[PDB]
């Protein structure tokens, strides 16, 4: 096949990376593996290092004149590419071996293990009112050559490359998502019983969702309107828990449920970005440079609950609100995931 490449501005330093996207299987993530090309006499005294830094970057990098990133370093690791280190961990891999065969002796292997307790590539949508790019957790691989780790950064030395960490749907479907609500009155024995059920717990982007809602209005009040919407929750954790919730798609129908009556229906609602181009705070899946994408892919948590809260977490929920006459408004909420299938 092919291999992506990036070279230093000087042209003496070049790094070859096996893949641009990385995937996790909920127990082991595919290791980040690459090789670096360098001609020794250019440095002749220095050493070569590669860094995988994950940052809570804000704004952009195109020399924009504005308050730039709060550059919190979530997790940083180091590896001495040159001079050569012990063989681990553990071999040069098949791609590494093939690149060494292709190039020869001027390549140097480096290896990396992404801990399972790290976030997923997410990017907040930049608001039109502000300028430039917006904040969002992102990965980065930076290869630099220097005598010391703390030696000053040089543009000709350091080479910058961007990677993404995304998840793929498990093949095992989960339990049926459903809920119920029985709302009585303040004193009278009449009540209001409603039912909500879903087609599935997993969906693909653009694929419509048919919510199965049923109402048993064996009561005295009248239902004025039914509100159907899907809510997005973005758990942000830098050093304190935060939660910026925002709706993405809402559909309404002027249907009236009379007292002492039953009413059930199915509604079609689709989460899509075309109608929410301006809403600041919406979460989008990680971009490469600036290209568009879908909505933020729902991030499933591992079985062992631990914490995993070291970045941006996103989840989706659907709520149906029943507008009951002269008070007594009640709504039903329900969770579900929404993210890509397994490619080939």
């Amino acid at each position: 096949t092919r291999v992506f490449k990036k070279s230093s501005p000087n042209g003496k330093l070049t790094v070859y990376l096996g893949k641009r996207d990385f995937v996790d299987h909920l127990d082991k993530v595919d290791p980040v593996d690459g090789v670096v090309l360098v001609d020794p006499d250019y440095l002749k005294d220095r050493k070569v290092f590669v860094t995988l830094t994950v940052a809570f970057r804000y704004g952009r990098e195109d020399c924009d004149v504005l308050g730039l990133s709060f550059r919190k370093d979530l997790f940083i690791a180091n590896y001495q590419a040159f001079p050569p280190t012990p063989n681990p961990p553990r071999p040069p891999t098949r791609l590494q071996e093939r690149l060494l065969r292709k190039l020869g002796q001027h390549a140097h292997p480096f290896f990396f293990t992404i801990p399972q307790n790290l976030p997923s590539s997410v990017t907040l949508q930049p608001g039109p009112e502000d300028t430039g790019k917006a904040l969002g957790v992102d990965f980065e691989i930076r290869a630099f050559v220097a005598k010391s780790l703390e030696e000053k950064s040089h543009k000709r030395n350091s080479v910058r490359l961007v990677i993404r960490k995304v998840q793929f749907a498990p093949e095992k479907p989960g339990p049926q998502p459903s809920a119920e609500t029985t709302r009585h009155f303040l004193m009278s024995d009449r009540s209001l019983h409603l039912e909500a059920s879903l087609d599935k717990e997993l969906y693909y982007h653009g694929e419509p969702l048919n919510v199965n809602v049923h109402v048993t209005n064996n009561s005295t009040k009248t239902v004025k309107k039914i509100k159907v919407s899907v809510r997005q929750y973005a758990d942000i954790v830098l050093f304190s828990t935060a939660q910026y919730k925002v709706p993405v798609a809402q559909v309404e129908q002027d249907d009236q449920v009379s007292p002492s009556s039953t009413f059930s229906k199915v509604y079609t609602i689709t989460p899509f970005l075309a109608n929410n181009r301006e809403k600041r705070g919406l979460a989008l899946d990680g971009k490469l440079k600036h290209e568009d994408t879908n909505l933020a892919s729902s991030t499933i948590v591992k079985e062992g609950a631990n914490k995993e809260v070291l970045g941006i977490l996103v989840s989706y929920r659907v709520k149906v609100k029943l507008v009951v006459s002269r008070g007594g408004d009640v709504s039903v909420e329900l969770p579900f995931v929404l993210m890509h299938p397994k490619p080939h």
Partner: antibody
Amino acid sequence: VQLVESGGGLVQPGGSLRLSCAASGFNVYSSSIHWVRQAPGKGLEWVASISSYYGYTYYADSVKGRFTISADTSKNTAYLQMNSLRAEDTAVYYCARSRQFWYSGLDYWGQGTLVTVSS
Amino acid sequence: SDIQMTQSPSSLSASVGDRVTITCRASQSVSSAVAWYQQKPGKAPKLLIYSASSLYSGVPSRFSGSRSGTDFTLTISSLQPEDFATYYCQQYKYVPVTFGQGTKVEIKR
């Protein structure tokens, strides 16, 4: 899953026409609609495309401005209106579908209809 | 800008069970967004190769594709007697997409 068209015929040059392709068995938002034309005995070439999920539109340079494209999510139907027709625009027209995530070719092709412009 | 293709040969003839190679060349570099399309005379076309190496579902394995820089190789192992038609080449990572000029394949006698 199927794909059907309707709206072919003969149009006076300097006139206008409107074509439709109804989609069934798949989802409009999780897909995209592209049209390509093929002159008789020539190689088929791309004309227009609409991306409902992104709310974006595109057109060929030779037919920029002259053509429009629209989509209706209620009936799972796409609509495009042809204006300022010229004698060279006559060809056979097709409606096509493609996976939105991601672009992987044009898996389904309609039965196709022809457009003739003459006096 | 306009990324024009240049295929060759425009036409060729073969027989049953022959090795047939048709080449697609691109005026610029395209990574993998190249597809192979076959169109029977008078009917709707249909995809054969997408992503420049994958064989689409519902297609006999006798078809195969290959890439070499800006040159693309499309081969058939044992040409079945109902495959005689035209073939089309396209690249689709730049807007707009561009198609080939048609390549006729027919039986020899």
